[PDB]
């Protein structure tokens, strides 16, 4: 191998050129494969987004306040349509003096019905200590471990950061005002 | 008034917390063997998965796969227009009416 | 199947009450499908995501200048010597 390489690249600059070209070719082919897999992953992510958009059409991401307000809005629109139609029908039937006219205004406006009940995301319970998630205890050999970091310089045991949803401040109340002092870097807010 | 929001919380790195990234990490890049494995399976005529077949034998009712540009990405879709049934009589219930107030057997 | 107006999780979505929409999407769906992951999303790349591996980054190199030093240094004992007094090891290991 060394013979075949030095035969074709006897000098250091040529050896370096060949090495760099090898690296570039490797990187390019790796980029091709990664681009293909990235296209697949992009498609899967887009289908996840489509699922989440579907949930929003059904009001799954809405809150109960928003659901009630939409319900009231439909109710009010329907009520107003009905009473306006009643006023028109009564006026026309009064000027005509005929009950069949009122009867005929019963079918001037029926796709389906409004939903009887609704379910949302905020009704699903969450909590490490919340007993709304606990049916039976999960055995210890199936529960996951918290990360461990311990050295002279830093640790992760003087505080608790929480879960992905229910987060909390790692530092305690007396040193929260001096959080800037427990950092190698600090990027403050914009205001 | 939700898009293009301002920075509300601070961003920081605690002292001596590790980073796990070397100096060539920007030149590092990922890789999966799945494309090469697919090419090799196709070329060597190895056992295919059943996701290449649109028909679905995994249930009694007929299902057909809908593919998103690739045999690796599919969802089964049922074909039957299912008939539903109700062993219920019509017109026997008026839930809007309060029945505890009306006098009768239905009310009791 | 017993308390329909009180169990909304097992109920159809509001798109089902609307009576209006090769293969079509199904007309009836429950909210209980929210308790499943791969109900609506596909199972593509399900078992191939734990196979995308990345190597570590640690380099085990440190120059060892002994010309700077002229004294010995202490050293830990890591394991007990079993090549000597092997037969008695369970009997004297607890002493000091």
């Amino acid at each position: 191998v060394n013979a075949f390489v030095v035969k074709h690249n006897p000098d250091l600059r040529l050896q370096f050129v060949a090495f760099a070209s090898f690296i570039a070719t490797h990187m390019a082919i790796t980029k091709e494969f990664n681009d293909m897999y990235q296209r697949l992953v992009d498609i899967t992510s887009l289908l996840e987004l489509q699922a989440a958009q579907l949930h929003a059409s059904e009001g799954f991401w809405d809150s109960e306040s928003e659901q009630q307000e939409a319900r009231l809005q439909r109710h009010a629109e329907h009520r107003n349509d009905l009473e306006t139609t009643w006023e028109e029908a009564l006026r026309e039937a009064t000027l005509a003096r005929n009950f069949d006219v009122l009867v005929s205004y019963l079918n001037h406006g029926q796709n389906g019905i409004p939903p009887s009940v609704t379910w949302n995301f905020n009704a699903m319970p969450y909590g490490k200590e919340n007993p709304d998630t606990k049916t039976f205890p999960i055995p210890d050999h199936e529960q996951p471990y918290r990360a461990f970091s311990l050295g002279f310089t830093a640790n992760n045991l003087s505080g608790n950061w929480g879960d992905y949803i229910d987060r909390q401040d790692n530092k305690n109340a007396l040193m929260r005002p001096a959080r800037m002092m427990f950092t190698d870097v600090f990027i403050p807010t914009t205001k | 008034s939700m898009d293009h929001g301002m920075q509300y919380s601070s961003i920081y790195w605690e002292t001596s917390h590790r980073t796990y990234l070397p100096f060539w990490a920007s030149l590092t890049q990922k890789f999966s063997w799945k494309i090469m494995d697919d090419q090799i399976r196709s070329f060597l005529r190895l056992p295919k998965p059943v996701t290449t077949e649109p028909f679905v034998f995994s249930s009694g009712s007929p299902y057909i796969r809908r593919y998103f540009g690739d045999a690796d990405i599919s969802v089964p879709v049922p074909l039957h227009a299912p008939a539903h049934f109700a062993f219920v009589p019509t017109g026997t219930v008026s839930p809007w009416e309060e029945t505890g107030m009306e006098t009768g057997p239905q009310g009791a | 199947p017993f308390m329909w107006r009180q169990r909304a999780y097992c109920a159809p979505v509001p798109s089902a009450f609307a009576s209006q929409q090769g293969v079509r999407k199904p007309l009836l769906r429950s909210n209980s499908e929210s308790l499943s992951v791969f109900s609506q999303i596909p199972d593509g790349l399900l078992g191939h995501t734990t196979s995308v591996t990345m190597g570590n980054s640690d380099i085990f190199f440190l120059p060892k200048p002994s010309n700077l030093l002229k004294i010995a240094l202490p050293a830990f004992v890591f394991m007990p010597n079993l090549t000597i007094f092997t037969r008695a090891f369970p009997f004297y290991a607890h002493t000091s």
């Binding site: 990235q38 992510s45 | - | 591996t53 980054s57 380099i59 085990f60 190199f61």
Partner: peptide, 21 residues
């Protein structure tokens, strides 16, 4: 020898999975 052993130990013996988006 140290670079070779680190390379082998890292890219053959200490591979771990990573997420893809």
């Amino acid at each position: 020898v140290a670079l070779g052993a680190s390379f082998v130990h890292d890219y053959f013996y200490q591979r771990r999975p990573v997420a893809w988006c």
